[PDB]
Design a protein around this nucleic acid. Sequence first.
DNA 1: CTGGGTTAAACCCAG
DNA 2: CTGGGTTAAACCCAG
Lengths: 175, 175
Amino acid sequence: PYVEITEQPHPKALRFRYECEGRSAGSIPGVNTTAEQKTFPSIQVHGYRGRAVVVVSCVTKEGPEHKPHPHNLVGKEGCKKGVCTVEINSTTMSYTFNNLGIQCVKKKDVEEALRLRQEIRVDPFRTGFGHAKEPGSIDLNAVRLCFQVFLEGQQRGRFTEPLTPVVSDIIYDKK
Amino acid sequence: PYVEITEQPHPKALRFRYECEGRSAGSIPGVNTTAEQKTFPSIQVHGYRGRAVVVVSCVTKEGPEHKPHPHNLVGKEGCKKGVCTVEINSTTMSYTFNNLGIQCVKKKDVEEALRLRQEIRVDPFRTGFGHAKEPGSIDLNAVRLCFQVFLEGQQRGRFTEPLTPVVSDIIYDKK
DNA sequence: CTGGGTTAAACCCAG
DNA sequence: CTGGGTTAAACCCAG
């Protein structure tokens, strides 16, 4: 059981918006988004069929041990506290993120933001929040979507078994 | 007794700085500031010789009934609460503002600022603070220096007699 | 409402 | 430290 990123986020097709802009932030197209056929990022679990949720959050482009990136993910579907959580189709085993937007935190706020990511307890690679002290070290123009998948356990209704976090190609703030 | 603006502020020779920039804001040269001979704004009282202080503050470029402009004047000499107060040479009857800088308030702060100008009670033309409600109406790229001169009264040490406020030519934020 | 240019606010480099 | 360009953050126009 592992997750495959079947359609990668287009690396330069969405402007990140600040909270001060009061928008929906939009949606991140897929690499293959086309003229008459729009696309969106999508994953696919392998080796397993059953209940399984997915947590998506921003991690740094930076290092194999990517760290929580301050930026919040907002979206009509499942996004709370910059983290976005949705349940996967229990038979097809795939999900397509059609409303996943990136709301960029500005420098002044990086700390309080990372402060919150910690409360929520979202830390894909067990990186801790050391980077919250050194805020300028974080590149606020690039991120990667992190997909942490959790299989239903044995304790019915409790998604307990975590598959290994999978990181997407880098997404760069478009102008 | 009236005040003459003997050397007018150069209209385009100083960048206004935000409080967030943590500088001295500089000094406003005079219209005639030259290569080997730098100049600065200056006034001259006429019709009177004696004690007399001067209050300088920013008013709008706008209308003969200029209103308190949010921007604060800072300067090594006499500037407190964006308002700057200095005592005039009791014999020559002139003062030359060699350290008068303009610290620009940003939109978010216009209100609280004008709020404060009111507390201080600086309102040259009896305009009230109606403009504090409509903050976008104020052009944050131009100001005029207002020189309110007060003659010593009869109550020794109390500058009581106000001469009529005199307004300087417009000063425009340089890039 | 959305994409995307423009102004404003911050920041920072060179002298 | 200063002048003044540049990035970041806000804002806003056109479609």
